[PDB]
């Protein structure tokens, strides 16, 4: 009942690897690294988003064993997406990209064995 | 720091109400009530889905104050969607419907004040 935790965390690494792969690069790229809050237009980002998250941070957290289980991993992925939905206008091209990427994540995360 | 919990749970009720509304009825209807495991084709449902969830159950749980916070509410909504993604073939019409409905949920849940 904890070797399963180890195998699910292994799947999580596999999911994140696919999210980084060329296959999804057309819509994943806004999520690879932390939002650059120094960029023009992002002067209010930290006002609105209390807990920023991105795929490289998630990768480092997996590697530093900072997730107790797959559920904690999934919470950070969903936090990343919700940050995008919260901050941006609903017709923003980046929201559509988040949706395509969340598609990949939800399907893989759901089909993960337990 | 707990009157906010009360207001977020109020928003959750509002989100679920919208999910039940005519506006989304074309794709929400598979999710209104528990999956009927007596129906033809569903003889393996309980084998695959250890924790069934649906919108009417979520509604009753809100009303019976069974969610400590919005995060617990959101977990049951996401459990409902992941159950659909886990059980069904990825090209199944119901998966597409879950996606449209999860669209509604994620956008509202993200824009909820805190
Ligand atoms: Cl610029
Ligand atoms: Cl700016
Ligand atoms: Cl029949
Ligand atoms: Cl059957």
Swiss-Prot record, chains A, B:
Organism listed in the record: Mus musculus (Mouse)
Subcellular location: Nucleus; Chromosome
Disruption phenotype: Embryonic lethal. Embryos ndie shortly after implantation and are compromised in their ability to maintain an inner cell mass.
Effect seen on changing residue 94 to A: No effect on acetylated histone binding
Bromo domain residues: 3-112
Lineage of producing organism: Eukaryota, Metazoa, Chordata, Craniata, Vertebrata
Outcome reported for the amino acid change (mutating residue 85 to C): Reduced acetylated histone binding. Reduced binding to promoters and enhancers of BRD4 target genes
Name of this protein: Bromodomain-containing protein 4
Miscellaneous comment in the UniProt entry for this protein: JQ1, a thieno-triazolo-1,4-diazepine derivative, and I-BET, a benzodiazepine derivative, have been tested on tumors with success. Treatment with GSK1210151A (I-BET151, a I-BET derivative) has strong effets on mixed lineage leukemia and promotes myeloid differentiation and leukemia stem-cell depletion.
Site-annotated residues for Acetylated histone binding: 88
Family assignment from sequence similarity: Belongs to the BET family.
PTM info: Phosphorylation by CK2 disrupt the intramolecular binding between the bromo domain 2 and the NPS region and promotes binding between the NPS and the BID regions, leading to activate the protein and promote binding to acetylated histones. In absence of phosphorylation, BRD4 does not localize to p53/TP53 target gene promoters, phosphorylation promoting recruitment to p53/TP53 target promoters.
Domains (record comment): The NET domain mediates interaction with a number of chromatin proteins involved in transcription regulation (NSD3, JMJD6, CHD4, GLTSCR1 and ATAD5).
């Amino acid at each position: 009942k904890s070797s399963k935790i180890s195998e699910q965390l292994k799947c999580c690494s596999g999911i994140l690897k696919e999210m980084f792969a060329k296959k999804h690069a057309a819509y994943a790229w806004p999520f690879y690294k932390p939002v650059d809050v120094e960029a023009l237009g992002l002067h209010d980002y930290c006002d609105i988003i209390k807990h920023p998250m991105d795929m490289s941070t998630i990768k480092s957290k997996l590697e530093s064993r900072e997730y107790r289980d797959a559920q904690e991993f999934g919470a950070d992925v969903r936090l990343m997406f919700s940050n995008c939905y919260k901050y941006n206008p609903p017709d923003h091209e980046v929201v559509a990209m988040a949706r395509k990427l969340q598609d990949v994540f939800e399907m893989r995360f759901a089909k993960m064995p337990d």
